[PDB]
């Protein structure tokens, strides 16, 4: 999308692996605000928004929390309490045409700054102090939007860059988007410390003979002693017995 027409999206309700990204591309710009990039895959979020667009080369510095500029102050602004991050990878193999790719623009003129995550599309003719040159040209009757016009002769400072911005939420979050898992391969018949999908205990695991109903995950004897569990991987029922102990 264009700088002023970013494609908002939400990505929630998923086991999000934030390390599948790293196999994509060289990831020219990858720095995270409000959350560490290393500790992304594990942490959980309310709703993850993604805004994708293309800018010029020497304007990639303007996409940052609380940073003022001409693409940041005019057509795309992200909060100061921002949680998420921005990812930019130069893409002029599909974006720069011989002659000028007049498809990506940037608000150069406006009235004031915009609020964070404020997207505007209006393409009216900007004023001229007095009543403007509605639908015409003249002394200084200058449209607010201006095209980048990428060509394969522009310097690297004037080349197009594709960019995705993820906005997380951590306030009141119904954990829906994050990546834990990692199922330590199963061991049987040894008193072992186990953590089955959150149920933690110790004991020897043995092949079960009891039919858990399909919506059931636990087994208890009298006095709430957790007696059995079904595998969250193979859904097999296993019996738990406390490893041997006694007096001497």
């Amino acid at each position, epitope marked *: 999308a264009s700088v002023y027409a970013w494609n908002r999206k939400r990505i929630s309700n998923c086991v999000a692996d934030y390390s599948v990204l790293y196999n994509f591309a060289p990831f020219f710009a990858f720095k995270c605000y409000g959350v560490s990039p290393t500790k992304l895959n594990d942490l959980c979020f309310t709703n993850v928004y993604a805004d994708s667009f293309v800018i010029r080369g*020497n304007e990639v510095s303007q996409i940052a929390p609380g940073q*003022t*500029g*001409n693409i940041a*102050d*005019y057509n795309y602004k992200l909060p100061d309490d921002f949680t998420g991050c921005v990812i930019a990878w130069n893409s002029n193999k599909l974006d720069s045409k011989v002659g000028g790719n007049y498809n990506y623009r940037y608000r*150069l*003129f*406006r*009235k*004031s*700054n915009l609020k964070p995550f404020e997207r505007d599309i209006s393409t009216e003719i900007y*004023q*001229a*102090g*007095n009543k403007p040159c509605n639908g015409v040209a*003249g*002394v*200084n009757c*200058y*449209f607010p939007l*201006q095209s980048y016009g990428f*060509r394969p*002769t*522009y*310097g690297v*400072g*004037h080349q197009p860059y594709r960019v995705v911005v993820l906005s997380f939420e951590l306030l009141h979050a119904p954990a829906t988007v994050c990546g834990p898992k990692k199922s330590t391969n199963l061991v049987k018949n040894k008193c072992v410390n186990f953590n089955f999908n959150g149920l933690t205990g110790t004991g020897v695991l043995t092949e079960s003979n009891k039919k858990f109903l399909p919506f059931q995950q636990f087994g208890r004897d009298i006095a709430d002693t957790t007696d059995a569990v079904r595998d969250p991987q193979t859904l097999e029922i296993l019996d738990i017995t406390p490893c041997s102990f006694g007096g001497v």
Partner: antibody, heavy 118, light 109 residues
Framework: EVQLVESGGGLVQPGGSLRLSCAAS????????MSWVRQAPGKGLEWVSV???????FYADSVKGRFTISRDNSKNTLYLQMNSLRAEDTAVYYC????????????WGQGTLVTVSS | ERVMTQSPATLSVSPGERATLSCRAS??????LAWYQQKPGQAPRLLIY???TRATGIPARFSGSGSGTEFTLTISSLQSEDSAVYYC???????????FGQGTKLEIK
């Protein structure tokens, strides 16, 4: 005619302060990219400052931290306060309205000489 | 910050003929440019911006050309009053930016 006329030019002792003023007509300043340029006697020009139409202004590095552009939107005028004028700053200062890629700076100010005691 | 260098410094051509001024950049300047005619005694005046676009009012006697790192201003028929200083100002980085040249002195006979 639409114009910007300037004042405040003169002479001041080193370490002193100064204030350049710019009045306009037939054109607004609050919503107009403003740009102060200056010229040392006999030499070229150099972009001194800019104020955007939303207010986010910028200054060159040679004068960064010392000069400050502001604008009395209520009465359609621009101002630039200068301080700590040193031996270099002897120049004539111009007020300008820059449009940019769609037509470069056209309307300029009569200028104002700013020299120092010595 | 692309540094523009104009040339020549001085030029003496018979009246009524053409005049050619070259200004050379070191990086890319494609079509973010302008040419100013600073008649001696007041602020410069924009003649031709971008690649060859003639600013409003500016006599047709001027013609701009060039792209990339090299640009040129050309005057069709010099009259006695064309004597002034000229600067090619770039704005390849527009918000906030410009970089001026060393200027060119043009005279008559």
């Amino acid at each position: 005619e639409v114009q910007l006329v300037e004042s405040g030019g003169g002479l001041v002792q080193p370490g002193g302060s100064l204030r350049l003023s710019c009045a306009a007509s037939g054109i607004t300043v609050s919503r107009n990219y403003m740009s102060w340029v200056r010229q040392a006697p006999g030499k070229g020009l150099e972009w001194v400052s800019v104020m955007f139409a939303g207010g986010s202004t910028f200054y060159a590095d040679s004068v960064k931290g010392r000069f400050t552009i502001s604008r009395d939107n209520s009465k359609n005028t621009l101002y630039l306060q200068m301080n700590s004028l040193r031996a270099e700053d002897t120049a004539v200062y111009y007020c300008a309205r820059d449009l940019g890629v769609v037509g470069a700076t056209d309307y300029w100010g009569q200028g104002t000489l700013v020299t120092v005691s010595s | 910050e692309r540094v523009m260098t104009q040339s020549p410094a001085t030029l003496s051509v018979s009246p009524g003929e053409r005049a050619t001024l070259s200004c050379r950049a070191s990086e890319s300047v494609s079509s973010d440019l302008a040419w100013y005619q600073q008649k001696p005694g007041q602020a410069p005046r924009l003649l031709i911006y971008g690649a060859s676009t003639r600013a409003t009012g500016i006599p047709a006697r001027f013609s701009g050309s060039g792209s990339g790192t090299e640009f040129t201003l050309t005057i069709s028929s010099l009259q006695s009053e064309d004597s002034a200083v000229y600067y090619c100002q770039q704005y390849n980085n527009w918000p906030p930016g410009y970089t001026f040249g060393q200027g060119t002195k043009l005279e008559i006979k």
